[PDB]
Amino acid sequence: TEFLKPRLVDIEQVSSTHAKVTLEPLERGFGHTLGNALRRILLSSMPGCAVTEVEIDGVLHEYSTKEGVQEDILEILLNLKGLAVRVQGKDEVILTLNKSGIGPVTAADITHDGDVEIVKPQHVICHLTDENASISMRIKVQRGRGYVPASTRIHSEEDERPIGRLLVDACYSPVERIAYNVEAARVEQRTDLDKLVIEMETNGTIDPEEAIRRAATILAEQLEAFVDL
Amino acid sequence: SVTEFLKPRLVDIEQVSSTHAKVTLEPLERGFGHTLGNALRRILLSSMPGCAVTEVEIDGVLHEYSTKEGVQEDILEILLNLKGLAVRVQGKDEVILTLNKSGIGPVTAADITHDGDVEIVKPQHVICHLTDENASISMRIKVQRGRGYVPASTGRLLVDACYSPVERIAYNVEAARVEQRTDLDKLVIEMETNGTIDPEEAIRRAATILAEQLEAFVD
């Protein structure tokens, strides 16, 4: 009986989306146990904030098309689904997108807010193809976790949403791929101490320093039952 | 509800026997059944600590290749059967016991030199059978405290050490539902232990260790 506890010795934020973090020291096997449990938890349960509804000024249904736009309304909605933003201390927010003139319509055109931060401003929503062409939409963003298809959503809302509100399927989970690599560390002049290095590719909304802590918190609280016998 | 994951209530703990039970957890979020079950297995099966025999010295024999007479079973069989012995050792790292027996009859675990600090959980554990009127054996059995199941990788004789008392743990996940969804997991855990530690507390320990390892990040 010599067990040591892991500590997040280092975190390397190599990019706005890709990062690595090392937990050290870890005894035998704990590298595998933590690496896989935390991988599953981070892939499944990490909350994020994603677009949930859209409302464009002059359109009626997603299958229609807007005048002077290169992308059909369906492709506009698909592009909006890929938008990734942060919100500061709110459960939902409504952002207006007001734009006109020939050229692209990028996420920068959205009316920025102090509590709303866009991870990739270079996101293109659609292309306007007329001098007087213009699109205004009211995007709705909600916090959450997991993936909520629109079919489940409207049938759980239990009220008839008005004509012109289009609903997109939200993928709240902000992490894309989580890999863990276990490798020895020179600690206390003794071997068989695994340094677990987790490298995660995210959308860029959350920082790993909080992601790993939330995953660990989830694991511990679920673990409460097995110690409650 | 972004931080409101479901917490299960144990349906049961069917102790099919004093050694093994069927602890069932219900319900768990989808994907949490394996996340918890495999981690508990990985703790119990290879990191649980306990005291087990690791070295043996039989009287006047150099190796299990040599099959000393007077005993119905061979030295290799003696070593495997001695490995099966479960012990509870209080407050020592390693101990040297002595087992001595004589007469026409089997040698049973009740015959060891009980120091009082050492508890042999199964006195009825059969060791071997003596096959002569003068058949007598005496051996020094080394016990050591450690963790996990140490193989034979390492006048002494080495034996595999079953420090972890969990003989077997197997788990299954299955569909369980609430009033509106059938995507949730019910976790059926089964474990059989050597008997030194009751299973229901064994899992309590396992979760203990894991939770401790999670302490530095959770707030």
């Binding site: - | 009033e179 509106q180 059938t182 995507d183």
Partner: protein, 50 residues
């Protein structure tokens, strides 16, 4: 109304009531068999491998 209580009624009605499953073309008698049903979210019929 597919009330959530109606599902509890179904889960009680279907408890021990066999259902006959009958792939067609049923050349031999083993092509029709009785099974104890269990509710599944999807729309496909869950069949046993063996």
């Amino acid at each position: 109304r597919e009330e959530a209580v109606v599902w509890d009624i179904l889960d009680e009605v279907i408890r021990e009531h066999p259902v006959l499953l009958n792939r067609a073309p049923t050349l031999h008698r083993l092509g029709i068999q009785a099974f104890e049903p269990v509710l599944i979210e999807g729309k496909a019929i869950q069949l046993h491998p063996l």
